[model samples]
Target: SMSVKKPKRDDSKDLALCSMILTEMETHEDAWPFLLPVNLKLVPGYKKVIKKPMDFSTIREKLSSGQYPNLETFALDVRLVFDNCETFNEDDSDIGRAGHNMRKYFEKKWTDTFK
Candidate 1:
């Protein structure tokens, strides 16, 4: 016997996500490759309450100059995580529920700080 997983029925969330991604891709075409995935990783990491003792504030202050390039690296890494999640199902390690958990993480925190 075989089982198949189905996509979520209410895709309003997905639509909203699509809209946000399209807008970002349009405005940050050059950096979109990095910004999208990296930010997504942050969403799950922060949602799972993974503490970073490294002091992101200090890191951000120092990184004020090449932020866009930084985002490129960040997004690339996040996309790698997404790929790993698909093949490995290792989100249970630190970022369980890659899609929803990550989305919630960003929705809660990014807006508070980035806004």
Candidate 2:
């Protein structure tokens, strides 16, 4: 039972985290699908099927706008991003593999960044 959650630090620490993690994913090949979002025009059911749509672009935009008031909120924000994709598509469907791969990578990178 090695677990401890720390709600320490101002917006300062998180801002750097935003920079670091954002840049890392933005540059990755697997992140291509997650970079933007669903094409509402073609895949109308994408959003319909997936009520909670999340992407790197929206997150980065939120960070830039300082919309995330809670650092912890930013820390645990990817739940929807990863979980949503898995719910809608399997690891072999569409960009499913990317979402699956990106989830672990995101977590691993998150460990590196700290909360």
Candidate 3:
């Protein structure tokens, strides 16, 4: 018989995946740019440029607090960071390249993990 333990906060595979992948992402060297919210002081036009700004810090809080219902919803927040990155930075620029690399890494990880 299965020994039932305390009720886990994350009962779904979605939350676990989101949690672990976030740990992996936050540690990536290129992830510095995405770790925290962009500074409006540094880039004053950021607000107008990005209607909805996203970052790993806020994502971590949202996921940890169980705000996300499933993997698809969590994926939306993850993908949004990259979208904002590419929109503001040039393709060949530092942050732009990092964004591309991280996005590709996440796409593969997401598929392999879920599939």
Candidate that beats the other on TM-score, 2 or 3, i.e. the better one: 3
User: Over all chains combined, what TM-score does candidate 3 have?
Assistant: 0.87
**Clash number by candidate, in order:** 2, 0, 0
Candidate 2 C-alpha lDDT tens digits along 1-115:
2587677555566678766887887787888777777787787578678877888888888888978876567655665777777877777876788888888887888787773
Per residue, candidate 1 scores C-alpha lDDT tens digits across 1-115 of 2587676455334333433442443343232222322343554554343322222232233344444243334333334433444343454444335433544443454354324
The collision pairs in model 2 are none
User: Can you rank all candidates by TM-score, best first?
Assistant: 3, 2, 1
Per-model TM-score versus the true fold:
0.25, 0.80, 0.87
lDDT of 1 at 79: 40
Best by TM-score: 3
Q: Best-fitting candidate, measured by lDDT? A: 3
- Model 2 clashes, total count: 0
Q: What count of clashes does model 1 give?
A: 2
